[PDB]
Symmetry: D3
């Protein structure tokens, strides 16, 4: 292995410069199966890597795990191995009333409610997505025909207090995050997730291209629990979009 | 006499216009408006000069903001009250990357917030990001007229001198916070310096308004009078062509 | 010209070391007319410059515009040309019930609700006026006989949200500035304006003398819309004080 | 399941109130095997859970993954299920010249170079370990006879820039973290890891008991590559200490 | 004198490496009297210094005054003279309902509501007590038989607004501290005092050992017992010093 | 016996006094009070010593604050509760400008806030500014007795050592934040270092109380590190005469 965590060599990639980066290790195979000649490379901790082919060109699929810290490890080590373009796909909870479950969201930039992004750039630096990657995702969503929303995402280091959840062990939220959801809502923020602030900041400040797409599985203004059947269809919809976007970026 | 506090305009003056081009210089307002059909002056107060014109049978507004976030925030807020929903900024800039030449055109995706006024609308963690439709329109308009274009991040400062790390000043010193800042921005891939985009993009993105940013390079910090005039005409043609696609 | 923005040479000043700095470019001609031998020097962007004579000594009047950014340009370039003393004249809105419309205010120091001051000194540094300039303004106010208050001013980078105005397009104020006016009121702050924080900080941290005087045109506890008759008389009253103060500082 | 991520019910725990929380899902079986009646419960994403018995009392072992974010999900959902005491075991890189590879470190408190801790308490709040937990670990290390150091730990949201590593894709470190290692060294900080700031802050501010122990696999002042032989013995040493400390806290 | 403020030479210490550091200059004699052969060395400003014998070993008692600033002067100058272990004793106001007047509190670490700690380490650094010192204080509390609580302390640069007191001249508390007591209460913070954050931070970041113990004289949620509580706590800090010689 | 928590004073003890001179050293209180008519000792508790005197037929208070903002904030609050409305501080200082000499007098217009206590009264953006009437009286009194006076900005630190960039210490190190800080304040025109002005001026200006600050230079940091004990004695007596004369103008 040429790297500390992923368990991969330069030869394993076979000249790949683009990677799709989901959060769940168990979802890596499903994405790679949509492309040609899928093969397993490695699995260590939360990092599972598969290789595939797209229009005769090698492509990587690699899981990051939950959160900025493990995402920062995966992105750095993939960059060392030659990756220059990163496309993230994940699940999300919407905070706007007009956004429904099953909708697809493309992130232009993120609210930095994380710690890892500060290790690459000061807070004043924008957590902005690459223009070519964002274009490819919006065009891919229109190609397959989905309800799409484009805008700002709130990216939090926690699932609970940072997203103003009160049904917890303590039942309390620290002063800084008290009434924060209502503030983001008024500012036009679409949704909550946990990795995009880190990914977009670290790529934009290091000459790497990054894009972000997500499927809505819950709306915070309507309900609190997701549905099992609709989630699988929504995940399938978002996967098709990210693969189609990767096609345009090769 | 007036519906607003500073601009001196009524809703009737706009004639249903929802788009506005916002330069910094009051003197350059006439020049932009003359490129479009039926140009007419409306008001001239302080640093704010407003002109109305017609683009493809649709009314468009041109209004100067002056230098800096404070007066930009006054102009944008008062124009939004009058019915404007789309704002397109055009200005001059100094490039900090060696590959970007004088005469090049730059489109801003988002800005580094080295200003104060942006914080009056959203906390620092909120991204000073441009609208996707506006950015697309500006990029496609630049390709239409044929120009050397660079797309990326811009540093937006509340000063011209210390915040942009200039040492040829009265004091000859730069405060600790900004010492070595230019080298840091350069390493992070930041294209250029200007003085208004962070305020404009933050206030628009956090209030449901569409904003875009385009600039012409007149100097490179790592390295002519007539070349500055040609660069302005090149950039002005792009912002008008982009406005056509957004109507 | 020897400067980037103002369009002036060192010769145009003719040995001048003091400058009166208003905000409105249209007000420059009125202030210069009060002094002997007025002449137009330059007009570029928001910067209009006039040269006059006071007691046989050359004096400059130069507009800064609204806000710290353009003010920082004007002051720096004037300092390069030889100016060592700066006196600001402007309008203001009072936040104290005991201060009435028509009163004159002299600022000792300012609350830094701006960005430009930070480009010259860290936040812990006081935005304080020069003692000789402040004494000259107070004694000039007593010379003409006007109701004067001396104290602290809040200096904001915006006209609307930073001064807690809710009659706007969005009708919202960001968390940081919510309830800020009530806090400044309890702390004894007299008024709101938009330039003093930048001017006083940049001068005090660079060895330049600076003073600040203002006329109250509106009271926030009483009304919102100003007048026409009383505004003109207050602006004529305050201008007299700033010229009289310049006589003492020459 | 009673929770969102772990895939566990309250009855699965069988009355357990203590959990050992490693980072690596693969290390869970190895810790559980030291105790009586070890059995698998669930495996979802980076969260693997096993149940065992210690002196006739049920105990839980659950993986957190790398980083504060996934750690915060695991700790919260375990607290919902009845866990009140948390003991972390991990690997670390030492930054003091007097600490040898193979040594064991017990953390009294942590430097907060993370984001997640801020979602529970403001920066001024100490990321401090529980006194009873710290005592148990120190006495357990004395029991088996290991070389032990007790003190402060630096806890970072990144593996690379936040720990001032320069052998990377960019080869640069952001201004904030430039020269930071030398600063921590002078302040007597022992080591770098990635989860203790989150764990200790979130427990101390919510009435939960937490302790932290680690085995040194590399010294940053000596070499940059860990020895893949003594590492197995070091991790075996640290596991024995955490299990013996758990015995004392039942 | 070998120092700027304290008025002491290295010879005055007679080889002492441990110091008990109260806030009150008038309480220095009272603490020393519990040990053998106490003698006054110096009295300058708010710094009163006595030396005594404990189990045949010399021990220093030196007042710091109220607040981080004067504390930082005393600790630094004592370190120059050879002191390596510092044990603080004081009074406190509890903010938890379960802690009674007369109880004894041992601080593991402190909430940094002070300015002086920042002059030694950035805010992210923990104001944590030394493990050996904390252990000795807990064991000494059991030795005399007190009702003891161990945990986190809020350390403030003011007595009034920083501790959310509204019975003042202004009757107001700045926004930053409005509702702060309730927040600390929910986070399990035991009490308020004015020096621990400075002491613990400056010692932990400079290789010096420090411990903190206090007697509860008032409960914020709720003369006679005030003197008894102080006598109880002083006995503990001297007994703790015995185990650290 | 006492109307306050710390000072050990009743409102009746003040006899109608509204002005207080506030030094740092408890042992310097008697020296200032001896300059005025009918001096009497009221109380001595902790670092707080209080004397009462008469000035031009009007009662005046002298009360020590101790070193640092924390104890200063206690003294000021409890004196205000007893009716004091005007505060004048006197102390010793170390100059950081080459042109300021030992024996000079400094009057502070406003202070750089390198303290913690000031934040408990107003956010950092609020200026630590002195009262205009108090400042005017201090400058005029200095010219009255004839002294070399400088008016400007003071750096007010929560420590004596690292916050004032002293390296001759036990550790020999200064935290990143304050490394190179003295050179920065020097370039910005800051006159000197002391330890209480930021707290005093902020808390008074934000609560409707009048405050003034004056100090005597006993050391210059660019010239030396250890003050001459003979010159300190003379400078102290010089500064005390000014603060009493300034108090006369404000009654
Ligand atoms: O609100 C959310 N915030 C987020 O940050 N994310 C993104 O994934 C983070 C790790 O789960 C996310 O996705 C959601 C949506 C959501 C709501 C409730 C419970 C969720 O979790 C797992 C689960 C439990 C039961 C059935 C299906 C899924 C997810
Ligand atoms: O470096 C820059 N930073 C900027 O923020 N801007 C943007 O305009 C801000 C107000 O001028 C900007 O454009 C430049 C480029 C530049 C370099 C040197 C001098 C400049 O000033 C005005 C000028 C001087 C002489 C002839 C024409 C214009 C502008
Ligand atoms: O509340 C104020 N805050 C301020 O910061 N300033 C200072 O001028 C900033 C530039 O406008 C200021 O002056 C005022 C008073 C005021 C209130 C309402 C409208 C104002 O604007 C211009 C106007 C409109 C209608 C009639 C006369 C003047 C000014
Ligand atoms: O310096 C460190 N910082 C840390 O934060 N951690 C803690 O684990 C975090 C996830 O690896 C940790 O442990 C170390 C020690 C270290 C140094 C170099 C490479 C390392 O990585 C994995 C590995 C690769 C090859 C052989 C053994 C271990 C670990
Ligand atoms: O609430 C407190 N906060 C604290 O920071 N401290 C610590 O001592 C700091 C200086 O008193 C502390 O101890 C207390 C307890 C307390 C409450 C009310 C009055 C107090 O003051 C002195 C006094 C007044 C009247 C009778 C006896 C003692 C002390
Ligand atoms: O540099 C200084 N910074 C200050 O903050 N102060 C103000 O007094 C604070 C408590 O000493 C202050 O005064 C000085 C001048 C100074 C320098 C070295 C030693 C000093 O202390 C007492 C002393 C010791 C030996 C001979 C004479 C005086 C005072
Ligand atoms: K993870
Ligand atoms: K302007
Ligand atoms: K003190």
């Amino acid at each position: 292995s040429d790297v500390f965590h992923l368990g991969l060599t330069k030869n394993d990639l076979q000249g790949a410069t683009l990677a799709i980066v989901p959060g769940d290790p168990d979802r890596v195979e499903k994405i790679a199966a949509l492309m040609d000649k899928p093969v397993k490379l490695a699995s260590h901790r939360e990092f599972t890597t598969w290789r595939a082919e797209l229009d005769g060109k090698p492509v990587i699929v690699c899981s990051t795990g939950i959160g900025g810290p493990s995402t920062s490890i995966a992105v750095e080590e993939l960059a060392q191995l030659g990756i220059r373009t990163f496309l993230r796909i994940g699940t999300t909870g919407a905070i706007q009333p007009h956004i429904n479950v099953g909708d697809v969201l493309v992130t232009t930039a993120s609210v930095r409610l994380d710690g890892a992004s500060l290790h690459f750039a000061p807070l004043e630096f924008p957590a902005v997505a690459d223009f070519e990657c964002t274009t490819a995702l919006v065009e891919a969503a229109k190609s397959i025909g989905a309800t799409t929303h484009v805008g700002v995402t709130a990216s939090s280091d926690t699932f609970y207090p940072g997203q103003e959840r009160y049904d917890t062990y303590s039942g309390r939220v620290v002063r800084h995050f008290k009434g924060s959801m209502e503030e983001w809502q008024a500012m036009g923020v679409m949704n909550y997730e946990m990795e995009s602030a880190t990914l977009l900041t670290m790529c934009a400040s290091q000459g790497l291209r990054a894009g972000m797409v997500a499927g809505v599985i819950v709306n915070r203004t309507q309900q609190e629990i997701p549905n099992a059947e609709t989630m699988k269809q929504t995940e399938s919809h978002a996967v098709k979009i990210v693969v189609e976007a990767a096609r345009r970026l090769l």
